[PDB]
Design a binder for this molecule. Structure first.
Ligand SMILES: NC(=O)c1ccc[n+]([C@@H]2O[C@H](COP(=O)([O-])OP(=O)(O)OC[C@H]3O[C@@H](n4cnc5c(N)ncnc54)[C@H](O)[C@@H]3O)[C@@H](O)[C@H]2O)c1
Ligand SMILES: NC(=O)c1ccc[n+]([C@@H]2O[C@H](COP(=O)([O-])OP(=O)(O)OC[C@H]3O[C@@H](n4cnc5c(N)ncnc54)[C@H](O)[C@@H]3O)[C@@H](O)[C@H]2O)c1
Ligand SMILES: NC(=O)c1ccc[n+]([C@@H]2O[C@H](COP(=O)([O-])OP(=O)(O)OC[C@H]3O[C@@H](n4cnc5c(N)ncnc54)[C@H](O)[C@@H]3O)[C@@H](O)[C@H]2O)c1
Ligand SMILES: NC(=O)c1ccc[n+]([C@@H]2O[C@H](COP(=O)([O-])OP(=O)(O)OC[C@H]3O[C@@H](n4cnc5c(N)ncnc54)[C@H](O)[C@@H]3O)[C@@H](O)[C@H]2O)c1
Lengths: 321, 331, 328, 328
């Protein structure tokens, strides 16, 4: 049984070949996306594997899939037209909650210890002293509020709770297994009481610009906001005003609304990076990362491997469908 | 019962009044040093309390203290170098300090530095701001902390607290200490020094500074570390030989370093209005490195610390007024 | 809106009455099972709610249900097997899959620590031999020096793993299925290695034909002499005959059980004659290195609350054309 | 450098020998006390090592030791009351901390067993033949409970860390303040701990001021539903009061490792009825009490450390050290 992959990064190659030989299956691969100009690669193979940057819209692709004997399209991550599929589809729902959880905790502690602000003072003011307004506090004295708790949210809960912090959380769905780490409560109580506020809900119309002006004035003036989820959750202009006028103390971001313009590209002009990024990027009480929270070996390993072991059980008779 | 307080900063004042009311004690305060000029204030006090910026130089100070009947000189800091002990015995004066005020303050900075480095955050920021590059390269892929071993040199109050946290997050923690403390076995495994260096993904220093510990981390020691590994020093600068560290980072012997403290720091840390001349190239070379993080010896700098440096000090003196003899006495 | 409830116990009531005044909903209840007789209280109801001990085996019950405009039969437990699903082509069915994993996790851990500390064994020499000395073979160890092994890791296994890991123990595990979210607390490995390496073996798989008698003679011999077997899952996973033989010979050191094959005879019953109680229970219950509880690992306020409230909330969702995920 | 050891028990032998081999030292041993017959063994030796059951009160042994030229008497316990300090004027060392988690873990084990009502369930099963689940034996997850500690040193702090990891709220009263401990608990006053805790655990040393610290008035302050744990020293509790409080429903149960008056029967076999007290027997019959015979300490780690910390102390002595375990 043969498999054909698409969208592969050099970092993904070792784990493919490490699996190919382990599960004794022949594998053909390529960095380019699946289109009508690259379906021919799927001759023989039981399954195609993709990690899409965009819609696979054109639909002779699907025709050609099932004519070649492809049993399944398995994604490594809504970019699939579900009507043409009626082949089985799969996805990778969970690869590493702890990767994103760990970035969340990291960015929150950095800000809390006010490291960005000390380095500004040191490097721009040549000022190595300890001002009253830069005093810190221990995590166990603080309380962390989570907006949404799923796979990622709860891991964030388990970590902070392990460090002695009180965690409180608003979700539309009650999970009892999470009760050892957090107290469920309403949205508003989360914003009011919380010393760190961290976003872990999905992206939907009802969830777009969830955090804007109202919400930021509702937070504690000493609080930090953390978004390691999706940029469209935060109204950026509002964030930026809130930060200037000091309605919060800081922000840690792994993502921004309208980020696809420049996140993932290289060699950009000043003119091709937006001014809102340049503004946040300059604030000592902000930290930004290029949507990298997911980026550990475990994530790369499981994105590739979970999907291929899926594909082998479909070349015979799993929950990923 | 009365106590005189010297060197009080605004930030202390609320912990001071807070403490003077919980206990039945009258406190005189001054933001000034104790010298022959200000020793008066000590009148009818059982203890004075300091946070010196410099030596208590004057014999007169000590003679006039015991003549007032002041039992003890309490420091609000670990360091007692500023007190003349010849004269404290000559004048029958007790001295106490505050060695442990908030171990987690420091332990939490330690973890914080480790994680930032581990997640290559400063290295991404670099590519972002200066190479106008927002992609994910291969050599900047991260790992989760439960997959790593953390190696502590010295496991005392701060080390054990580092151990409990990283252990709570699932790392394997191994450590070298000259002293065996069973208390700490749930959180770490003792090993020998060579092993810690060789096997650890993170090496964090937590030993005191002695002649026998000066330059503990030098060239030979950075060679023994992993290419991927990170050196954390939130203890004392002199433990690390900087020249050597700079070279090791440049040669890619280790991957990065988190520093709360440098050798030779005292001539710039906690100073302002510095000009380029007075900040060394040592610091500057390190400070441009994206895989280095530096704080100005602020690991201790939390509200608990400041509060506890007032209160652990003041209650010690309350027990001396009562006839107490606490273990914070410096002998 | 209206809902009728069967099999209700006094411990359930406050929670039901709490939910009722909160969601503005009428609830009529009865301690007794759903049958031909008692189907009469389900009039006008959007839903029924059951915690059954027997099959709902009578067809008439179902017909009159869909005759009253009853939309769903909601279980307050995991097992939907006390329902005929042929006849439910008339009726939706919901259950409560997870209500409090930690309830079962905390019982597992408690039973393990007890045997590990050898308290039943101490009390035996104290009470029967008048002996309060400390012999060599009753020495104990710290949990953080032991490695704990799980056959099966779902909602309960993972909770068990989270706890032991939190206490500083090493946890290993065998599962047919990989759950990346559990790596911070354990290491996956094969069935054999779990048994060979563990100091405490605890069982968390579900009852299936292929899982029935998972632990027998061969497996107990492979465990360490000093190891402890925990079953807080399902009793048919363990061959009681073999277990007894293993315990008597010193092939394992002790066992904690919340459940036993055949238990339906006496678990749940009172005033029992010594005939009514089987010989294998009486043999295990006499051993100081055994501890047994009568299938109450689940038995906390949280589980009682959630079994009632999750189920009701679901019914309400369905009273408004809901479809929640707990449709079965 | 040669060492005499007294009071050794089979369990200690391996670590004695393993340590003897690790360091180039010779040890001689004997299971009996150091008295004026067995003193002869310590000839040529640099130090002695005891683990006492009663006083070394023969003056000859002291002066026979310094004549043979021994430099220290090392104990393998905390207690030094047994050495007469008049005759040491010779050095003396004890082992104050060998395994705090051994005791903290007993504390936790006893508390969970009580919390889960296992004794109460076993009583109904074996004496009432009743295997059902009653309202009053509903249980709770630990993370929903709050734990009160009187005293927080080596042991009480480990209890705090463990229960904290399990997600309980820990609150504590201590006369001394330990910043190191705030991630695990919240300090408060004594009354408050008694008033608000679902489990009260005692961890203070015994002093004239601390004896009968928990008595009639304190158990009235606690909750109907709270458990008292004493894995510390028995004189800390008024057994008469505790018994009467358990009888009256003032608390819901207790876990004891020690009892006021135990040295009459703990560590003895085989005793008459006259020799085991009424209070002990009353307590032992209560399905909501658990009692172990001062075995909290009794682990591999403890045994090993008791031996190895004392011996290395004796070696630092022979080389000129004088370490901090010296008690004069
Ligand atoms: N930054 C990265 O590199 C990265 C990588 C992967 C995922 N993510 C993001 O992390 C976020 C959480 O992902 P996850 O794996 O935990 O998925 P998830 O579905 O398990 O978590 C979402 C949780 O939020 C809850 N929720 C849904 N709607 C809500 C609302 N309106 N208000 C509050 N809560 C609501 C859900 O009940 C669920 O428990 C997602 O937005 C995901 O895209 C980021
Ligand atoms: N960054 C800050 O603001 C800050 C604040 C407080 C303390 N510190 C520094 O952190 C360090 C440790 O602090 P602490 O409170 O834990 O001290 P400590 O006495 O509580 O612990 C020190 C540990 O080091 C061990 N040790 C001694 N010599 C050793 C050696 N040669 N090799 C290995 N281990 C050795 C000791 O046995 C002890 O366990 C000190 O240097 C202290 O000054 C920094
Ligand atoms: N003591 C009680 O009162 C009580 C209460 C609730 C549940 N239980 C029992 O607890 C057990 C586990 O429940 P859960 O909620 O953890 O279930 P689960 O389905 O959530 O977890 C089961 C795990 O079993 C693993 N598994 C399934 N079959 C396996 C096999 N053949 N070999 C190895 N692993 C396998 C699966 O990967 C799954 O992850 C069940 O037997 C349940 O009936 C007992
Ligand atoms: N169960 C066993 O077999 C066993 C074994 C070892 C120790 N112990 C007992 O456990 C107890 C504690 O041991 P440790 O090692 O933790 O000792 P410790 O010295 O470390 O701690 C005692 C704590 O009690 C606090 N304390 C003192 N007086 C107090 C008071 N009046 N009120 C409140 N707190 C007070 C002290 O500040 C100290 O923090 C001791 O009684 C010891 O006897 C029992």
């Amino acid at each position: 049984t043969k498999i054909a992959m698409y969208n592969v990064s050099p970092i993904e190659v070792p784990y493919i070949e490490d699996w190919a030989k382990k599960n004794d299956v022949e594998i053909k691969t390529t960095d380019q996306a699946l289109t009508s100009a690259t379906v021919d690669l799927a001759e023989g193979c039981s399954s195609v594997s993709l990690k899409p940057l965009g819609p696979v819209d054109e639909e002779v692709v699907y025709q050609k899939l099932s004519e070649y004997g492809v049993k399944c399209i398995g994604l490594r991550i809504n970019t699939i037209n579900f009507d043409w599929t009626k082949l089985l589809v799969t996805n990778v729902p969970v690869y590493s909650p702890r990767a994103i959880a760990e970035m969340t905790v990291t960015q929150a502690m950095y800000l809390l210890r006010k490291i960005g602000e000390f380095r500004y003072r040191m490097d721009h003011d040549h000022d190595f002293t300890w001002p009253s307004n830069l005093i810190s506090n221990e995590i166990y004295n603080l309380t962390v509020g989570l907006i949404g708790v799923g796979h990622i949210g709860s891991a964030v809960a388990e970590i902070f709770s392990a460090m002695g912090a009180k965690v409180i959380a608003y979700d539309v769905a009650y999970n009892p297994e999470f009760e050892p780490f957090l107290t469920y409560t309403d949205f508003d109580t989360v914003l009011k009481e919380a010393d760190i506020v961290s976003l872990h809900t999905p992206l939907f119309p009802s969830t777009e610009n969830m955090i804007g002006e109202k919400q930021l004035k509702e937070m504690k003036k000493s609080a930090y906001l953390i978004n390691c989820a999706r940029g469209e959750l935060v109204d950026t202009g509002a964030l930026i005003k809130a930060l200037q006028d000091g309605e919060i103390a800081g922000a840690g971001l792994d993502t921004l609304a309208g980020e696809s313009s420049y996140f993932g590209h290289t060699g950009l002009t000043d003119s091709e990076i937006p001014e809102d990024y340049k503004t946040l990027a300059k604030m000592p009480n902000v930290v930004i990362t290029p949507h990298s929270a997911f980026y550990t070996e475990t994530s790369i390993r499981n994105m590739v491997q979970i999907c291929l072991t899926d594909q082998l059980t479909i070349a015979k008779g799993p929950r990923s469908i």
